[PDB]
């Protein structure tokens, strides 16, 4: 019956990328088809904004409508942590419902990033996997991306953040590639972007060498 | 000696093929780690033999090759 | 001949920084005392904008009135390359002077950033020098910063770049450290910020054990 | 048409080199059409010496004539720092224009020159960059050359001097070499000549992975 508004907080990668800073999404489902009018209101820091954007409603089979609306606001305004408010009003709802969305409040912590070279047992498999773990970041806003200078990697795996005992978060990023590419000393890195990180960018490149005491296995030459 | 409790397992996630994969992390002290203590992760799955498979670590990863670089004098 | 109006280009650091939005400043110098207030007009692609601001007049050592006006432009707008116009009207000035600036146009090519480890005698002296160079950028809008284990310390050398034989500009950056800092092996980050780089910001890490090729290294000529 | 005078400091390499004859040039531009000839007077050590090198006048679309007066001085006279006086008189100018040139000899500091091993990543690029650091000099007149195997290098880049916290300027010398030349073990020498330098020459030899001790050292990886 009554439409229900779902809260979709901005993805921190959206805030970081230049092209998609202003986008803020309000989504409403279970909208009654009897009432065609939809009222949308944005409250930023307690005041109403003049400009608004709303896409046409989407028809659903089960007598429901989907309403997606986009609000434009500076990314630095969202980074300030001020509360944002979304209001959706319709004739079906006896009273308007106000929803508040804001970034999680907490003490920022500098995350730690570590890369792991593949185990010896994995060269039996055709595809070799590389892992980059990040840990010790209290906010849930994190962006980990695999990067190579020669060419960006199509494959990209990331597990959802897992709560830690101390209250921070940790996760892993996985990249599967071919054996030949890894053996040829290809440059790989896991760019990590966090609100607490300085410059909002940290690069930890992984080298081919595993640090074994003997890897050359070639007799050296002395020249005076 | 005995099983531990300071271990966290990530929820399973999808892959390109479709088969799931996940990680598990255990936090320990460096004093016991540097002493050469075995640490084993046991996985129970239906497809595994006897529904049990243990993988152990003896901090012996990256063992140097038997061959060594020859030293000469000029 | 009366007040002079200029439009200073935005600083390179603010232009390429997502957090610090670029700022466009317009300056009026030698303003007549009898006419301190000057009418300001700011146009973005021929459109009036209400976000322009001007700072209060500040006295100069030469007893000449100087006026500055700042406008906050969109970070994406500078990437696009929009046109901004500043117009200053003064009663003393017979004809207003308008200054026009535009974003540099050129082929975006990814610069290469290299790090030079100190030699085997650089630690003999009291100060050890760490150098990071950037080559192969056509636009002059680039930023280079130094980072030491999360402690911001930059010498702001900002040595002027010089064109190469192929026309690809290059620049160098130098930092001075102590013997203990170099011998510790802590990571030192040369951070480069340019249009052509991925995500507009990249870093290069240099350590004491920055790298040793598998091939033998000769100790004598 | 508003005649102008410009000051051109002399090249230090002319004075430092015994074979090269030092020359001091004073140049006048924006000479009006009605008076192409400019009355030029030259004084050294407050006295008149009979030598002059006046360039012939040339026609330009802006009706501006450039006149250069060149004076010959000895190495000892140049090292003294005595003022050289150029006086220019024109019909259009109500009064003669005076200019003087004299470099300041203050706090002569012997420059320190260092060479760094090539960066690891440079082996991937088909061009290898060689860097020569020089610092510890107060004056801005420094001579730099790249003398490889006894013959000067065709291409070399010199960064302009910049300010420093120690009060002495520093700069870099960049050389580009092919990977094949560096693979065979070619040796390049960076020669630095300064007015306060001992015997006006400092140089050293470098190779792949330069090491001051006679030992094979390898860092962590």
Swiss-Prot record, chains C, D:
Effect of substituting residue 65 to D/A: Enhanced ability to activate the classical complement pathway
Protein's organism: Homo sapiens
Part of the full-length chain shown: 238 to 443 of 449
Subunit structure: Immunoglobulins are composed of two identical heavy chains and two identical light chains; disulfide-linked.
Constant (C) domain: annotated segments: 1-206
Reported impact of residue 200 to R: Enhanced ability to activate the classical complement pathway
Domain annotation Ig-like: ranges: 3-102, 111-206
Name this protein carries in UniProt: Immunoglobulin gamma-1 heavy chain
Biological role stated in the UniProt entry: Immunoglobulins, also known as antibodies, are membrane-bound or secreted glycoproteins produced by B lymphocytes. In the recognition phase of humoral immunity, the membrane-bound immunoglobulins serve as receptors which, upon binding of a specific antigen, trigger the clonal expansion and differentiation of B lymphocytes into immunoglobulins-secreting plasma cells. Secreted immunoglobulins mediate the effector phase of humoral immunity, which results in the elimination of bound antigens.
Disulfide bridge map: 26-86, 132-190
